Amino acid sequence: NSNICEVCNKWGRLFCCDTCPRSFHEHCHIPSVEANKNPWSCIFCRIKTIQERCPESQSGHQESEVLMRQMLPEEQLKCEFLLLKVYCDSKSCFFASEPYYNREGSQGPQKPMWLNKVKTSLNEQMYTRVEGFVQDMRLIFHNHKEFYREDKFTRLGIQVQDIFEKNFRNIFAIQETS
Numbered sequence: 001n002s003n004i005c006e007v008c009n010k011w012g013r014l015f016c017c018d019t020c021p022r023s024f025h026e027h028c029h030i031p032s033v034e035a036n037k038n039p040w041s042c043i044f045c046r047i048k049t050i051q052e053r054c055p056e057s058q059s060g061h062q063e064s065e066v067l068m069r070q071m072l073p074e075e076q077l078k079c080e081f082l083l084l085k086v087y088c089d090s091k092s093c094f095f096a097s098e099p100y101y102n103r104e105g106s107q108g109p110q111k112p113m114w115l116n117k118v119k120t121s122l123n124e125q126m127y128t129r130v131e132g133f134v135q136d137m138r139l140i141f142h143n144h145k146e147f148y149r150e151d152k153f154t155r156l157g158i159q160v161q162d163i164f165e166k167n168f169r170n171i172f173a174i175q176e177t178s
């Protein structure tokens with residue numbers, strides 16, 4: 001197995017996947033690495049299994065249909081993995097914890113949002129459809145773009161949103177377009 005966490009790229013107390021060479025910190029994995037379970041398969045392996053069980057699941061989909069799906073177990077897993085892929089980018093640090101807003105010439109957002117809040121919301125089964133999760137994710141970046149206005153720091157929101165959106169298109173097999 002790898003000797004660094006797949007998500008944060010640090011050593012420490014690592015849990016190893018039995019079906020692939022990835023490793024994880026307990027709370028870096030989503031869901032948090034399960035207490036017992038031997039063998040244990042990580043989220044990357046669990047997603048790969050879904051695909052192998054239903055090869056047609058990789059055919060193209062419309063975003064509108066994906067968003068209206070109910071959060072049954074497979075969709076719950078896919079949103080967990082998508083959240084995880086965002087945390088895998090080091091620029092996620094900026095969006096992880098609860099933000100505060102005090103900048104001359106800007107007003108904070110009406111509905112603040114952050115990764116750890118989405119993480120808790122998924123854990124507590126608060127989203128009933130994929131749309132709920134995707135709306136909160138996109139709101140993170142939209143709030144940032146609006147608040148930072150012309151400061152070059154706005155680019156961090158663009159960058160992390162692009163990671164989100166590429167991974168959304170991949171994980172949910174969104175039909176490719178120009």
Ligand SMILES: [Zn+2]
Pocket residue numbers: 005006007008009010024025028
């Ligand atoms: Zn980690």
Ligand SMILES: [Zn+2]
Pocket residue numbers: 017018019020021022041042043044045
């Ligand atoms: Zn694995």
Ligand SMILES: [Zn+2]
Pocket residue numbers: 053054055056
């Ligand atoms: Zn099938």
